[PDB]
């Protein structure tokens, strides 16, 4: 019956169920929802409520987060019909950790703030399993005493919280982080492909590369899978590829040039031509292995 | 006057001072030789022998490691005059660790073993640092009994070896790590700036980025400099772009596409055209930069 | 005005004013009480509420948070004027985190449930730096509801929770940690004295151990202090002495029988006979120094 | 036919077989030899060359090791017929790395530089494990010529050697080391079975040790096993029981009273009555355990 807090929680995709899971586990009455129904199945066995709708939770809850897969889908949950914008109002607090463009989260703080809401973006970096262990990193932007306010929660979901100050800077961040990422996984898919060919072991290479200095835990995480050619999505490579493009029009804004970045980018699109989108992001390895 | 190991050294470069000292400071007796002779002082002071020429240590020691800045340094060493080549003969080995490719070293291979000696390639991973303190990785390829007889040298030298099979292999082996790095540079350059463009700190995104899934000592270590436009050189960009090139040449042969690398090879040409060429690798952020 | 979540504190000793400041930092509100007033400034600084006794800040809060100094203490808290069971019913929760036997736990837990109230014990793991980090080790015993509940406050105390079931089992398992920790103290001091004595380095002592199959945490910490001769108090030897204690009543109570903390014990009390009881529990070493 | 080092090698016993292997498998040419033949076959199939007596293998190599069970044994192997004092002559050089007092190590000093040799005491901390890892950590003293020239050897060994100075430093730094040690086993076992005997999990109190501020390698590689009754020898009970004698006669000489280690050195005369002289020193807990 009695609990420290409750949070309502939108979008149960990969990242979201991890969440919302962590936040149940974790000893906060969570009230979800998703388009998806079936998703909810594991949620309501540990105790969550849920509601029919974005606006039911938003109704409910007084704080709300809120996780879904790409900006098309963090704008219609907040603006379409049964939306959180309908039941936003003074006091309620929604905070979108979705991974989006500064566009994105700028015009759904205005829509917020404007019905008398608070609004933080805090998209994280961190993967399914980070999700899972409440080791992801939090780039928060927005209100500031909301995001304080939810330093609880954020202290659950993840091991670190940035503040990054105005809306807009975190998205910034956090397409940074994903940018870097995508042009990592490149490189180091190149390098797998260039030993394999030249007549080497990958999987020494791999060996190598975890004893040096560029050792992290992506290559050592992702490398093996990726010598198999085994690429169950943590992060889909459509939604990694996505961000590359994110990425660089922030860099077309700021008029930096990118050359990795864009070379990347287009790896990755040619990966997604060869029917690849739905698969890990490290799958774009086999964009750099076609041959015949 | 007395010692347990006893090895002759050819180079004295970043590299070679440091890996030279840590085997004087670990109770071998080294003999060195280098073209620029101040560059002998500190080790003298350290008990180290002297000679005029490579010919002159080979002559002298029944094993020689030598530690040269490029792939010409390393074939002039060997077949010039006073060079190497001139006093191998059976019982001579020589371990070249220098960073080359494959066609380098195989051509010293042949000399060397044509005139009855043998020879190892033992090109390593890692920079100035972990060669002062032991750490780098030995990838080695060529005799095997040769490799074998050397571990106690490479036990100082490194943290671990590889025995990567017939000359050649090492060569390959270490220019497909030197690849992934300069990539790596220069995806890691691309965000820093982006973030300083976009209105963001660079200083925090680093904080980001070391603490997730891409944390590598490499970003941890250059970062803080780069941010600071400070660009000691422990990895002479010149280096790191001429190994660019070798690593695409190999992938050229192999008809392995690296548009990720190839963009990387050009940012460092960008680089050596702004007069970086003598600063650390990581002043390829300065391609990235500058503007007007 | 708002927040997630929202605590009662009592005690801000070393403990529990590195506690509640953590929570306070954490976004919960805190209201908190002392004994010594002024201890309260810090947090009154940082937005904390305050009230004039325990009766108080029960009535306000549902769920309360202790943490004394010592079982008097915790026993004085709940059952003299003003204090805790006084404003004790439904739906509140108390949480004491002392460090107590099994009797004094037992014996608050027989009034809090009696007055119908929930409680649990968290004594807990980790001293004044871990509990500044948040890094202590929760060790929960008591009503499993109430500890579930409490998860998030934990989550920002510490870095794991143990429920351990019924009220009693934390006390006792606390008692056990601190035993091995006071003995552990004692055979570290025994050695560094020994060396001393002996013509050796202390300092040398300390790298050796820090390197080997019994390198941990408080030698680390503990160890350079120790060998300058100072004791800033972190966990005041009086109270580790006392803990001794408890922990051999337990023996005593399932008869085992426990010569090394037998004798841990004696040369601690040795050390109050000293002056050295306000002093950090490291100070036992000038009992085994002591000489004339 | 050639190596960069050879080296003489006597005592194949837990940790002699141990790091003797390890010289092999890292490129040295050793001889050895052992009073027990059959431990002999290992070190042969990977290359060993074996000799009669340690008087041989004395006359053969210019530097040899020692790594014997128990200081009887260390004094036999040099002072008994066809051992090694019989063929120590100018330029030969003694490493004894065995754990004995400074009575025995100074004693053989006399002896081996009265006849014209050089000695060092070498003994190590870190047990079976580290000792085929390369782990160890060498406590040297004595001749500081030969420490120096030792270095080589010492760096496959071990991860790290401290020159202690005169003879007699290395033998007391190492019976101190072991002393805290053998506290430390006994503190620790105490606790596991209190918390057994108490109603509580062993196997949690292990878990909560191993997050905190006393978490080591040996609490955590011992814990488990102790905690299943299970004993396999990596130390003997009856050598650790030793050195705390030992280490307490050091503590004898330099009026140092240490009555947690004296308490320590009774349980394992205790452990050894119950016949467990033969386990590993972590059987000692049978100690605390036994009851009826
Ligand atoms: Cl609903
Ligand atoms: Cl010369
Ligand atoms: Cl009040
Ligand atoms: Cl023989």
């Given at each position: 019956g009695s609990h420290m807090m409750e949070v309502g929680f939108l979008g149960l995709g990969i990242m979201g169920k991890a969440m919302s899971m962590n936040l149940l586990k974790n000893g906060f009455k969570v009230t979800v929802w998703n388009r998806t129904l079936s998703k909810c199945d594991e949620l309501v066995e540990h105790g969550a409520s849920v509601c029919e709708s974005p606006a039911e939770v938003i109704k409910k809850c007084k704080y709300t987060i809120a996780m879904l897969s790409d900006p098309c889908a963090a704008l219609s949950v907040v603006f379409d019909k049964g939306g959180v914008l309908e039941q936003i109002c003074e006091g309620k607090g929604y905070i979108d950790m979705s991974t989006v463009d500064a566009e994105t989260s700028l015009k759904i703080n205005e829509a917020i703030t404007g019905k008398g809401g608070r609004f933080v973006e805090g998209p994280v970096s961190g993967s399914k399993k980070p999700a899972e262990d409440g080791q992801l990193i939090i780039l928060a932007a927005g209100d500031k005493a909301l995001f304080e306010e939810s330093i609880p929660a954020f202290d659950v979901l993840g091991k670190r919280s940035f503040?990054?100050?105005?809306?807009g800077n975190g998205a910034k961040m956090k397409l940074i982080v994903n940018m870097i990422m995508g042009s990592m996984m490149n490189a180091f898919s190149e390098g797998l492909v260039l030993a394999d060919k030249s007549g080497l072991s990958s999987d020494t290479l791999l060996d190598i590369l975890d004893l040096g200095?560029?050792?992290?835990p992506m290559f050592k995480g992702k490398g093996p899978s990726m010598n198999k050619s085994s690429?169950?999505?943590?992060?889909?490579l459509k939604h990694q590829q996505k961000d590359m493009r994110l990425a660089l029009a922030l860099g077309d804004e700021n008029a930096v040039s990118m050359p990795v970045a864009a070379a990347a980018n287009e790896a990755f699109k040619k990966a997604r031509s060869l029917?690849?989108?739905?698969?890990?992001?490290?799958?774009?390895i086999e964009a750099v292995k076609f041959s015949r």
């Open positions: 503040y990054l100050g105005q809306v200095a560029m050792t992290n690429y169950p999505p943590a992060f889909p029917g690849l989108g739905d698969l890990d992001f490290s799958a774009v």
